[PDB]
Scaffold this active site. Sequence first.
Site, mmCIF file in Angstrom:
data_model
loop_
_atom_site.group_PDB
_atom_site.id
_atom_site.type_symbol
_atom_site.label_atom_id
_atom_site.label_comp_id
_atom_site.label_asym_id
_atom_site.label_seq_id
_atom_site.Cartn_x
_atom_site.Cartn_y
_atom_site.Cartn_z
ATOM 1 C CD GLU B 357 -2.817 -1.026 0.235
ATOM 2 O OE1 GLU B 357 -3.244 0.108 -0.376
ATOM 3 O OE2 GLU B 357 -3.586 -2.030 -0.162
ATOM 4 C CG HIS B 487 -11.459 -10.942 -12.024
ATOM 5 N ND1 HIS B 487 -11.458 -11.455 -10.879
ATOM 6 C CD2 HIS B 487 -10.413 -9.681 -11.629
ATOM 7 C CE1 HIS B 487 -10.454 -11.106 -10.066
ATOM 8 N NE2 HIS B 487 -10.095 -10.038 -10.665
#
Lengths: 148, 595
Positions: B357, B487
């Site tokens: 992150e 997806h």
Amino acid sequence: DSFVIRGDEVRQIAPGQTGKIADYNYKLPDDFTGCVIAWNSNNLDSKVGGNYNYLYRLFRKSNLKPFERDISTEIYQAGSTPCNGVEGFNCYFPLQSYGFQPTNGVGYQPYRVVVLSFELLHAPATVCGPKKSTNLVKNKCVNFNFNG
Amino acid sequence: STIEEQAKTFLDKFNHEAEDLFYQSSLASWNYNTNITEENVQNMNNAGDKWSAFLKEQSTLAQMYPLQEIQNLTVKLQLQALQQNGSSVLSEDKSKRLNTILNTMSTIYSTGKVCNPDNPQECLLLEPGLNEIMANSLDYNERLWAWESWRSEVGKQLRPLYEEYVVLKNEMARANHYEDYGDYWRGDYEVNGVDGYDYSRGQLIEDVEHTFEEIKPLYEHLHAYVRAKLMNAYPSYISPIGCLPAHLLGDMWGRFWTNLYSLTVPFGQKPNIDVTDAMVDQAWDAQRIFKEAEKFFVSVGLPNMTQGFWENSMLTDPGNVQKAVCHPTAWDLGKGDFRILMCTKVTMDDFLTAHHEMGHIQYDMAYAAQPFLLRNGANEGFHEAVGEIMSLSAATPKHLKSIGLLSPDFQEDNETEINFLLKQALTIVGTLPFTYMLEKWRWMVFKGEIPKDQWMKKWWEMKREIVGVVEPVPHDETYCDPASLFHVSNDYSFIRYYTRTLYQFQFQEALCQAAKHEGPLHKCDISNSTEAGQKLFNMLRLGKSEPWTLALENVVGAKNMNVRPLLNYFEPLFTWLKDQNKNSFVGWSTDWSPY
Ligand SMILES: *[C@@H]1O[C@H](CO)[C@@H](O[C@@H]2O[C@H](CO)[C@@H](O)[C@H](O)[C@H]2NC(C)=O)[C@H](O)[C@H]1NC(C)=O
Ligand SMILES: *[C@@H]1O[C@H](CO)[C@@H](O[C@@H]2O[C@H](CO)[C@@H](O)[C@H](O)[C@H]2NC(C)=O)[C@H](O)[C@H]1NC(C)=O
Ligand SMILES: *[C@@H]1O[C@H](CO)[C@@H](O)[C@H](O)[C@H]1NC(C)=O
Ligand SMILES: *[C@@H]1O[C@H](CO)[C@@H](O)[C@H](O)[C@H]1NC(C)=O
Ligand SMILES: *[C@@H]1O[C@H](CO)[C@@H](O)[C@H](O)[C@H]1NC(C)=O
Ligand SMILES: *[C@@H]1O[C@H](CO)[C@@H](O)[C@H](O)[C@H]1NC(C)=O
């Protein structure tokens, strides 16, 4: 000259600098003699929800002269189509408002910057620096300087 | 007076307005994610609707600007990215039908339940039940039943929805001057107007096929090893010649083989590198984790974190009174504000996730020096690659012993090295053939090379030939098995994972070669390498203004993606697998089936 500018464009107010503010809002001459002073004002000029009280000229037909103001609100005609005082295609408003939020990082926070321009003319000097004064002494050989 | 000046003025107006608008929208989204209530959701919905309406208006305004008269590459790229009128070229009824299909598919995939045949009073949900059964359970019958139920109760309901979705997407692509929807997806990799740095659409497919053909031996050896290891747990379920079953891959769809580490462990007598105990005995916290990550990033050569990142982010769980989503995401507000939403706990996995992150935030701050239309990575796989290279460089034993988690007297044994290499293989390369097969199937079903009565037939044919996976029971044309993925049922691309998998190894090899480090690639550290940091920042600064090929040539020295770094990263593992597969039969045969 006191005004509020964005943090990422503070260095634009300097002799020999370009950009959006240094060309359409406030420009300094190449032979400018003075000091530029700026400080962060995020605790005052920023409020929750967006502080849209400050604006800046984004579009203009030409650059500004040193020490020149421009309070015109005419619609910037960016194309060949004449703008009939209304916005639209090739017709944008020259003044745009800043977005000042308290969560903005360094660069987008409002920075109050003042410009002290020193001018020297044939008129007698009215503003000087604070002349320091020393203590007196008696019965001693000491050089003195009161006024001249 | 010229068209270029008007385009620049319009772009300046957009970068002025859309910046603040997206900043407000991101603030609303952050207030909603960090505080779930009835008002934050409405505020976020209003902000999103306003942002969408503004984007539509700006696109309809920019469509009146010709793209052939612009001579500036930056202005041309910004206009091309702004004039993306995808969901507006079709009719209103067709658009509403496509939106309804997307919504109902999302609801079927999310709100999808399946009840046991013997216990109708208690049903099983996807996340708590199906993943648990496919991961931590070993019973063959239970996993087979779970897989069949997941493929039947949800697959059959999405058959006409997918049949209409593919047609609507093909029509939308043909309306946008494209060949098919797969061509529309590959268009993101297309770059023109630059001499020598051009990249067509079929060239992407050719390069992917070449990389797959070059990496095929390593995956074949890995599959042979996994099959030889699974033959012990399943004596009469898996054949030494045929392919592996679909419900014995540790995943609901067989994507990641990470859950098979407990069965395919090379040396089970030595535990994996786990610094959780050494982290909890030294009185660590999420704040200390982020401080150490910032220290690592500033030692590499990247600037520090902003003050707002420390005075506004929520790096720890707020408690039970305030509800928030514990999903690690990187937030780019836009106006110099960067925050991270993650319920960071004291764990090595959480440490690597925090490093990922922070790498995302560093990339965001790097490309923040560009306009709003250019404030993005060079491609859909650069951000994840830049995060994963940092996550891998932070997981090295040298970095762990230099920080203070790993003891300095700990010796580097080759058994732990082989175990770590096998884990990295199962978690990275195990999904590459599946990704390639899924992407090729979607491309051929969007282009029209697969007839409607052969979708699942050719899907299983490819999954048995290209991949080493065979279906347990025959599924006819009513069991829409490919549509059982997130997806594919939510309109998300899949080749981005393969691209980022190549890019992470390319960047790792480049930064290790620039760091003047010798030895293996997996034991390479770039913590105190300022040259590699500068060479990476030279690529992170380009962002989306420059083509991705130029960024690659700037960061690794080549304008095309290569799989050689991936093979060099697992060279000791490749040698170990070749040494351990002397008697085993390498490869698989498509004639065998568990029928
Ligand atoms: C496209 O336009 C941009 C301006 O938006 C040009 O960028 C300028 O480049 C010159 C020379 O490098 C700089 O001196 C200016 O400061 C830049 N302007 C900026 C950053 O706003 C860019 O060069 C143009 N593209 C081409 C190929 O000429
Ligand atoms: C990178 O450089 C830093 C700073 O020079 C190194 O940190 C020092 O490491 C030595 C060796 O154990 C210690 O004696 C010092 O106390 C450390 N400095 C501080 C301030 O704690 C670091 O080891 C180098 N290498 C890496 C991978 O970070
Ligand atoms: C979360 O939202 C609720 C409802 O508006 C509010 O009472 C509470 O103070 C908020 N929490 C924080 C930390 O802002
Ligand atoms: C969508 O944009 C393209 C160019 O990007 C344009 O040719 C087409 O007319 C647009 N669609 C509509 C419905 O205006
Ligand atoms: C980051 O912070 C450290 C200490 O807080 C400082 O030594 C270093 O110069 C900083 N790096 C910057 C500001 O780029
Ligand atoms: C690990 O090293 C030891 C000692 O050098 C050696 O005996 C052993 O064969 C090695 N194992 C592997 C898998 O290379």
